[PDB]
Design an enzyme around this catalytic site. Structure first.
Site, PDB file in Angstrom:
ATOM      1  N   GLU A 114       3.807  -8.919  -0.889  1.00 13.55           N
ATOM      2  CA  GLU A 114       2.411  -8.515  -0.858  1.00 13.55           C
ATOM      3  C   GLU A 114       1.854  -8.727  -2.090  1.00 13.55           C
ATOM      4  OE1 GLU A 114       1.613  -5.357   1.321  1.00 13.55           O
ATOM      5  OE2 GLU A 114      -0.535  -5.106   0.866  1.00 13.55           O
TER       6      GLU A 114
ATOM      7  N   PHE B  71      -5.513   8.168   0.694  1.00 11.73           N
ATOM      8  CA  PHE B  71      -5.100   6.943   1.591  1.00 11.73           C
ATOM      9  C   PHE B  71      -3.727   6.530   1.703  1.00 11.73           C
ATOM     10  CE2 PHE B  71      -8.612   4.471   3.279  1.00 11.73           C
ATOM     11  CZ  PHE B  71      -9.727   4.985   2.881  1.00 11.73           C
TER      12      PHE B  71
ATOM     13  N   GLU C 270      -1.292  -4.356  12.598  1.00 16.00           N
ATOM     14  CA  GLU C 270      -1.663  -3.117  12.368  1.00 16.00           C
ATOM     15  C   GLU C 270      -3.042  -2.710  13.151  1.00 16.00           C
ATOM     16  OE1 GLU C 270      -0.618  -4.090   7.697  1.00 16.00           O
ATOM     17  OE2 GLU C 270      -2.009  -2.537   7.890  1.00 16.00           O
TER      18      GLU C 270
ATOM     19  N   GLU D  22      -0.561  -9.272   3.539  1.00 16.94           N
ATOM     20  CA  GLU D  22      -1.925  -9.520   2.730  1.00 16.94           C
ATOM     21  C   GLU D  22      -1.674 -10.428   1.501  1.00 16.94           C
ATOM     22  OE1 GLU D  22      -2.137  -5.031   2.526  1.00 16.94           O
ATOM     23  OE2 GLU D  22      -3.810  -5.295   4.200  1.00 16.94           O
TER      24      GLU D  22
ATOM     25  N   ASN E 267      -6.132   5.685  -9.194  1.00 16.26           N
ATOM     26  CA  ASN E 267      -5.477   5.858  -7.807  1.00 16.26           C
ATOM     27  C   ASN E 267      -6.311   5.762  -6.740  1.00 16.26           C
ATOM     28  OD1 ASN E 267      -6.056   9.112  -7.069  1.00 16.26           O
ATOM     29  ND2 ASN E 267      -6.134   8.686  -9.538  1.00 16.26           N
TER      30      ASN E 267
ATOM     31  N   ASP F 137       0.856  -1.152   0.034  1.00 19.45           N
ATOM     32  CA  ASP F 137      -0.089   0.029   0.012  1.00 19.45           C
ATOM     33  C   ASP F 137       0.924   1.092  -0.017  1.00 19.45           C
ATOM     34  OD1 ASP F 137      -2.256   1.774   0.212  1.00 19.45           O
ATOM     35  OD2 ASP F 137      -2.723   1.252   2.130  1.00 19.45           O
TER      36      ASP F 137
HETATM   37 MG   LIG Z   1      -2.105  -3.964   0.814  1.00 16.79          MG
HETATM   38 NA    NA Z   2      -2.495   3.480   2.986  1.00 17.55          NA
END
Ligand SMILES: [Mg+2]
Ligand code: NA
Ligand SMILES: [Mg+2]
Ligand SMILES: [Mg+2]
Ligand SMILES: [Mg+2]
Ligand code: NA
Ligand code: NA
Ligand code: NA
Ligand code: NA
Ligand code: NA
Lengths: 1011, 1011
Positions: free
Chosen positions: A404, A589, A525, A449, A585, A189
């Site tokens: 990931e 985030f 997390e 993930e 996009n 991410d």
């Molecule tokens: Mg991810």
């Molecule tokens: Na993020």
């Protein structure tokens, strides 16, 4: 061959992984960790050429520098130089999902270097090149001949350049592809970038050399005896005269040394390793390593002949510590841990994903000062220096492999696929070989993930076999799979279950006790700090302290991933997802940190600091009970400052010395506190203050604080006598009150106070109206977008209910004269399409002292979404410089994020009362206020407030903080009540029941005066 | 690209492994296993050109057929055609140990085929080629265009030829290399061969196709209800009308059927496999599979449209069975297995390593007939039909990956190396993907002799994740590591410990109970059947029956690995290591079989059949207790036949039917047995006959036997008083004794019966001398060679003490006349270097009947190695064609291998009194003999004899059986005592102490008489 579209080829001619090597030729230089002549930086100016695809690279580039190539600094991500756009996508792959293939249009960087190599480097021994990081795949040429290939963006690729180099001018030709089959295992991410973004260097080893070395430390039951076990392996010609010496140093004092020739123990029917040796060193009463005290020894490893001649030396920092899981508890040196951790991406607002010592040390200082003791390497192994700093400063580390695959359908499509096991293994095994000697690494991680697949089960076993000294964790497939020693959910909440099919996120308290579950629970997390966030963080920390097996978590995350762009004039602003023309996009985030990209703290960092305190306090009578949550150290650099205040006025202060053992208690008996006649609220405030400087903190650093209400004396004595009486005027469409030079005007048509006058001066630029909405936070919007609506998100619930476009339709507006006051009495109803949503009933009581008393009673419909706030707003005319308030402060605070804030008298410049979130939202609120002072104005009572030059309407209409224009006058929001801000996650409503405004009937009262 | 010298590249463009496909387009043909038109064979005539290295292969060969190339059969090994020398090497790699490099001189096979592909095959669908086994690496071209590359000799490699083929004639180019980086992983103790040794075939699937299916059958506690679960995976364009039907068939009866669209259960946060489906089928009282009753159902997978239209269909045989380890025992359907197993190598004497159905069925029939229920695929996945036949005929299989690295130093050098995990994983995961639907596969194995390294551990867990229905075993690293579910030693002995350091072999009885240890123990290799071996096979089986957790093992091994060579006269001989000019070699160590290369039993096989009997017997008084060792089946095809016999002659018999439950018992009372008045010993003898034929056995097949000593009355009555008295003539150096037409010549200088006359006809070619030696067995030799002496071995112990070159010295030779007989008394003392080894004191006694009574008294020095025998031998002048004896027979038997032999009168040719062991040694012995008849001669007593055309001296000087020439007359060795043969292993003294001749004093008596 298209090696970048072949998942079973990850490297060609790449040398084996190993722990950091410098190849010192002097024992003293290795013991002190001084720079080595044998390791050579090639960092600096290189040639760079951009190409739209590998096939467009001209044959000539292998020999001669291209005439249109520019000169750029390596290391760099080339997007940060502007040759193409950086992409921010969260889950969705930035390329089409067609494993193993990548787009034919594949951005291609052509780095090249001219560099010198001394004659003496090529006379003897081996000369190699270390690319510490290349994103994502690359081929390599030396003097035009083909050398090799490599994948995995986050581990050192090494190649032997011995036969390729000649004395003098040498040229490197490195072709760097943006997308590769390696890109499928690299879906974190984060900003998608590329290029030689880490160190390039040369290392010279003799032919007879140390190829690998492992250091282990085993202890007895009381940690009073230790044995340092060192396995050394060599390459080259084996000769009987060869020796290995491992010495251990306490700084300058040598504590242990051992010598032996090669040849290990008999291990199977075909013998032992002849090219290996294991040295055992006894260490009495070793100084143990922990984040609380990072005691380190230096281990020096020498290759030498029997007659004395040094061949080469390697060394490492050694931490004597034991990490083990027993009876469900994760233990460091026989004591249960409390992980006060954060996730940390390698991100710089200018340099992209290129790291440097200054940025690394600044982060580490900032973590340690805010009570953090651990960091997760989300979601890749970091730059090699990072670990050395956690070794030296004291931070536990989860080292995480570069896997990931979030974008897959289903998420474990590749990770259960055995055709993808080789590449996965190369990413786990090479992390382990590199980082295994680092004391700060206490936990391995299989990635992030990627669901749960047989490959995770297999490489879990591989690590357990190879390194029994560390637990392995992995969150994928539900956080409790067979591929993890630790239950490690993400965004799992404290009390609330989330029973998703296949992968439920149980309440962390409940999770621990599920039938047959034994393992410790540490979130990988939690507390998604996107925008105005970290609501309910206290509820996490309470649970952690209460439940032995809840051993903390890693906050997501440390720093905002905003990049710096520039405008017409050349002023820098913070850009997020989509500001580079990157499509698709995921916008804002990328910004989930406790600090802005420049390392300026978010208000959330103080709440984190306060909850992660290492001292807890209890008050009974006037005794203070201090409990140390340290496991190893005494409080030998800690002092307690106490002070008692009456509504902001200090009465008595004092400072008492702290002598608390780890896990221990101290009882401080306070002196006789002065009980004043005066009416008001007594508050006790205590602080732990570090009187001496540390490697990570200034002298007089505050580590922990806490407040109690002491005595309160209620005001019985009457208000001061007034013989003045306000005069009421009644026109067709205005109620007008008048006293001296003070003039209040109530519009009989709208129902609100329309204007105020002190002399011939206008006090308001808009009318004082009711407000039930707020400018949506990131926790308020969720994943919702104007093109794809998420009806569950708070913002949408409010929108469709018509909260925002609500028309106040007046019901009652009468006025009445009393003996010594004028009573205005109003009543409004905000309606949407026949439906009554709110009903405000107010009473305004102006008297002969000058003060306007306001009494508000609001009804909220049970079947409307609970309102974001219940208070009033106005645009004032004055623009004062200082805000001075009595209440919770000084930093921004909300109902579900306010344990950090203290009650007292706070005076700040107006601009500190606004929080510059890159994505503008409701902000700057201060809770639990009994008095607010702004210019001539003063509000009393009990409320929440925010004050700034920014209307809610503007903050909700403005996507970037740099687009915000300061308005005429000062917008003031005074809420009797304000909803929680949430934060548990940011893709579903996370505001807890107790912080929703569900009551149905609310009341508050405000005194408005002049001084 | 030197792909054959890189472990990071094991294939290129190779399609994923899967279970046997056929791509039927007719559901019925699929159900009955009818040949499929969509699966063509490419076997037959191919072109071949041998080369010294891949460099020597010309470019023109990709296009045009070479003129010098020959036309040979495919599949084949090119060594069997004579193109280069086959090499037998045990441990030491045939190539220099330098991974991953191979000799630049690398034998290279060029196989090329031109073939017709019909037009309809190319229009639609996918067309692939399957090489079921290429040794050891090969590049593939179609029509001059390069297709791909593959490794792993024993698993199929499949490539998509769709885009490469053309309408009309197509040409195939297969570059098969003898040595590659995979050869390091293929160090099995076997002939090192190369070439396309397995079926090549072409397969046409539609574009929308089944790509994978897994069958799993789970059960309820009592196995009265089962659930069949079928995971079906598809490739191609996914449409909403596609359906999967899985139907289960019992012969011609559909017992269950299930239909579903595509779309698995949700497995994680990103959804589920839209390309997968799981059909579950209920089964009431299913017919259980086992080696006892191989009940087989048939599963048909149909990929079809929602309306009925078939797209394709697959199938497999399904056996309802469950394998699990509980409380320390391996259970097959909740009942503890006793593995009567054997290792089988894929080896043919003419076709080398090419397997065919005929030989596979012959192997399986032969095994089942000899009481085997289990087979281990040593040491690689077999030909795909082996599993089918084991499914249908009923054998438990250990499916072993293609991984052996015995030659590395230490053994785990590559298996502990993470860089070798990728190439290692391929071999384990592709075995599982292929064979996972075969009910005969009950245990997965990780390989053979490759030490223990993390890679084993990683892959142990991979399997346990993918297939939780099968135990995983692996012997490396001490046979009880963390990579194995079963304690699976090789050649651990029953009582004797072998405490090798690091990897000890404990006595199996001790092993089970070691502190901590809980697992079952099934030896992966035991009873090394090298030549005249399998002494003490009875000890292993007494143990397996007494100890629940000793659940049997796998004999090493099934078949002799000899190849056929033809000498000068075109005569075929069996050849072993060295005979093809192969050096270095490990000679006869390739021949460890229970049967010869052409499947003719060794005498050992009958011992195995006997000890692996499924019926147990005890006898009390006149009651015969029968116990069943079957777990599932009744004794429906079983009948017990009994027979009593005095000194050979039957007195009673008849047969009683058998009706015993599994684990059950049956008592059978004998009718009154007529007690004969005549002196001698009675013997009860039972046999279990199968009256009806089976798929594996002819009617009348004997499956179990046993003997007992019943009543015995001794000889009381004196011999008939003869009237004659033999005359003694005493000369200078002769004692001549004459009676009628019979004469005895005793040499007074040697003390031996030098000659005998039946009238005028001479009886003895060489005198009657004592013998204390034997022509050393493989077991006596060990690994001892004439250049590297193994001083420990029995042959060397015997040599160095002077047993062979020992000189018989006369001490005494006197004669005396008696009242009716002549008496010669001869004392002798064998000596070597001033040391007496043996002293033989005899008396020879000739009386009026004309019978010689020899009475030997042997003292053996305590400090000399125990002799291999204590008897007499001589060479008769007669050559007769029948050998008739009363004793243990009919086949060869020794002291520690005779439990299978029975006591009776046996009549056989002379050629059956000799065992044609490829490696010649002491042979043909029969034990517990009371009477031996040869020509005119008869011998009475209690002795062990052998009789042949070959001397003991000839056997020990002759390396091959085909170099043996029949000597004049007939050699007869009568031993009062013979040493045991051993066989625990063939590399160290393995004769258990009770079968050694350690008494130091021996006595036996012989009666020689003419009849
Ligand atoms: Mg991810
Ligand atoms: Na993020
Ligand atoms: Mg690749
Ligand atoms: Mg290779
Ligand atoms: Mg071997
Ligand atoms: Na806890
Ligand atoms: Na202190
Ligand atoms: Na047993
Ligand atoms: Na062998
Ligand atoms: Na011989």
């Amino acid at each position: 061959r298209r090696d970048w579209e072949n998942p079973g080829v990850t490297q060609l001619n790449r040398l084996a992984a190993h722990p950091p090597f410098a190849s010192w030729r002097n024992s003293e230089e290795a013991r002190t960790d001084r720079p080595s002549q044998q390791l050579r930086s090639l960092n600096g100016e290189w040639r760079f050429a951009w190409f739209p695809a590998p096939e467009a690279v001209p044959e000539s580039w292998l020999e001669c520098d291209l005439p249109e190539a520019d000169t750029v600094v390596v290391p760099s991500n080339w997007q940060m130089h502007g040759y193409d756009a950086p992409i921010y996508t969260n889950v969705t792959y930035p390329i089409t999902v067609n494993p193993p293939f990548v787009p034919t249009e594949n951005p291609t960087g052509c780095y090249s270097l001219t560099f010198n190599v001394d004659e003496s480097w090529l006379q003897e021994g081996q000369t190699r090149i270390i690319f510490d990081g290349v994103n994502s795949a690359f081929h390599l040429w030396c003097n035009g001949r083909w050398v090799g290939y490599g994948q995995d963006s986050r581990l050192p690729s090494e190649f032997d350049l011995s036969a390729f180099l000649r004395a003098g001018e040498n040229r490197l030709a490195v072709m760097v592809l943006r997308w590769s089959d390696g890109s499928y295992l690299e879906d974190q991410d984060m900003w998608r970038m590329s290029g030689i973004f880490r160190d390039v260097s040369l290392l010279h080893k003799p032919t007879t050399q140390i190829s690998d070395f492992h250091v282990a430390t085993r202890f007895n039951d009381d940690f009073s005896r230790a044995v340092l076990e060192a396995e050394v392996q060599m390459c080259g010609e084996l000769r009987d005269y060869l020796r290995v010496t491992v010495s251990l140093w306490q700084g300058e004092t040598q504590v242990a040394s051992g010598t032996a020739p090669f040849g290990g123990e008999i291990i199977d029917e075909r013998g032992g390793y002849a090219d290996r040796v294991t040295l055992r060193l006894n260490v009495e009463n070793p100084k143990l390593w922990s984040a609380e005290i990072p005691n380190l020894y230096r281990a020096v490893v020498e290759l030498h002949t029997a007659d004395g001649t040094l061949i080469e030396a390697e060394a490492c920092d050694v931490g004597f510590r034991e990490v083990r899981i027993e009876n469900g508890l994760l233990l460091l040196n026989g004591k249960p841990l409390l992980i006060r951790g954060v996730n940390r991406h390698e991100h710089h607002p200018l340099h992209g994903q290129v790291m440097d010592e200054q940025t690394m040390v600044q982060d580490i200082l900032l973590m340690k000062q805010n009570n953090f003791n651990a960091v997760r390497c989300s979601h890749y192994p970091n730059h090699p220096l990072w670990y050395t700093l956690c070794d030296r400063y004291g931070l536990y580390v989860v080292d995480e492999a570069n896997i990931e695959t979030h974008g897959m359908v289903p998420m474990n499509r590749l990770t259960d696929d055995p055709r993808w096991l080789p590449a996965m293994s190369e990413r786990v095994t090479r992390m382990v070989q590199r980082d295994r000697n680092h004391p700060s690494v206490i936990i391995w991680s299989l990635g992030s993930e990627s669901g749960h697949g047989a490959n995770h089960d297999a490489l879990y076993r591989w690590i357990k076999s190879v390194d029994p000294s560390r637990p392995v964790q992995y969150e994928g497939g539900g956080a409790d799979t067979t591929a993890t020693d630790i239950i490690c959910p993400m965004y799992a909440r404290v009390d609330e279950d989330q029973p998703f099919p296949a992968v439920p996120k149980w309440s962390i308290k409940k999770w621990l006790s599920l039938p047959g579950e034994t393992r410790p629970l540490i979130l990988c997390e939690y507390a998604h700090a996107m925008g105005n966030s970290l609501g309910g963080f206290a509820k996490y920390w309470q649970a952690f302290r209460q439940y032995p097996r809840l051993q903390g978590g890693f906050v997501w995350d440390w720093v905002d991933q905003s990049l710096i762009k520039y405008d017409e004039n050349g002023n820098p602003w913070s850009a997020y997802g989509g500001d580079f023309g990157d499509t698709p996009n995921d916008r804002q985030f990328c910004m989930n940190g406790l600090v802005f990209a420049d390392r300026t703290p978010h208000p959330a960092l103080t709440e984190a600091k306060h909850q992660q305190q290492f001292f807890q306090f209890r008050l009974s009578g006037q005794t203070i009970e201090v409990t140390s949550e340290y496991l190893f150290r005494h409080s030998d650099n800690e002092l307690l400052h106490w002070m008692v205040a009456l509504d902001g006025k200090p009465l008595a202060s004092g400072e008492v010395p702290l002598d608390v053992a780890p896990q221990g208690k101290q009882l401080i008996e306070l002196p006789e506190l002065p009980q004043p006649e005066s009416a008001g609220q007594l508050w006790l405030t205590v602080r732990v203050v570090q009187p001496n400087a540390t490697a990570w903190s200034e002298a007089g650093h505050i580590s922990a604080w806490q407040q109690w209400r002491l005595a309160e004396n209620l005001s019985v004595t009457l208000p001061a006598a007034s013989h003045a009486i306000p005069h009421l005027t009644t026109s067709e469409m205005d109620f007008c009150i008048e006293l001296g030079n003070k003039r209040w005007q109530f519009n009989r048509q709208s129902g609100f106070l329309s204007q105020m006058w002190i002399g011939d001066k206008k006090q308001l630029l808009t009318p004082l109206r009711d407000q039930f909405t707020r400018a949506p936070l990131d926790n308020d919007i969720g994943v919702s977008e104007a093109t794809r609506i998420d009806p569950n998100a708070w913002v949408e619930r409010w929108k469709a209910a018509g909260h925002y476009q609500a028309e106040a339709a007046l019901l009652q507006c009468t006025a009445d004269t009393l003996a010594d006051a004028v009573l205005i009495t109003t009543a409004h109803a905000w309606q949407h399409q026949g439906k009554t949503l709110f009903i405000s009933r107010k009473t305004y009581r102006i008297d002969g002292s000058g003060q306007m008393a306001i009494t508000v009673d609001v009804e909220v419909a049970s079947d409307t979404p609970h309102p974001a706030r219940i208070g009033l707003n106005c645009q004032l005319a004055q623009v004062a410089e200082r805000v001075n308030w009595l209440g919770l402060g000084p930093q921004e605070n909300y109902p579900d994020r306010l344990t950090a804030a203290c009650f007292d008298r706070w005076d700040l410049p107006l601009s500190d009362m606004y929080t510059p979130y890159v994505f503008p939202s409701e902000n700057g609120l201060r809770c639990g206020t009994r008095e607010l002072n702004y210019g001539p104005h003063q509000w009393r009572g009990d409320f929440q407030f925010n004050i700034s030059r920014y209307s809610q309407q503007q903050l909700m209409e403005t996507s970037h903080r740099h687009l915000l224009h300061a308005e005429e006058g000062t917008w003031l929001n005074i809420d009797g009540f304000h909803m929680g801000i949430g934060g548990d996650d940011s893709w579903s409503p996370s505001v807890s029941a107790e912080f929703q405004l569900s009551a149905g009937r609310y009341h508050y009262q405000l005194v408005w005066c002049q001084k």
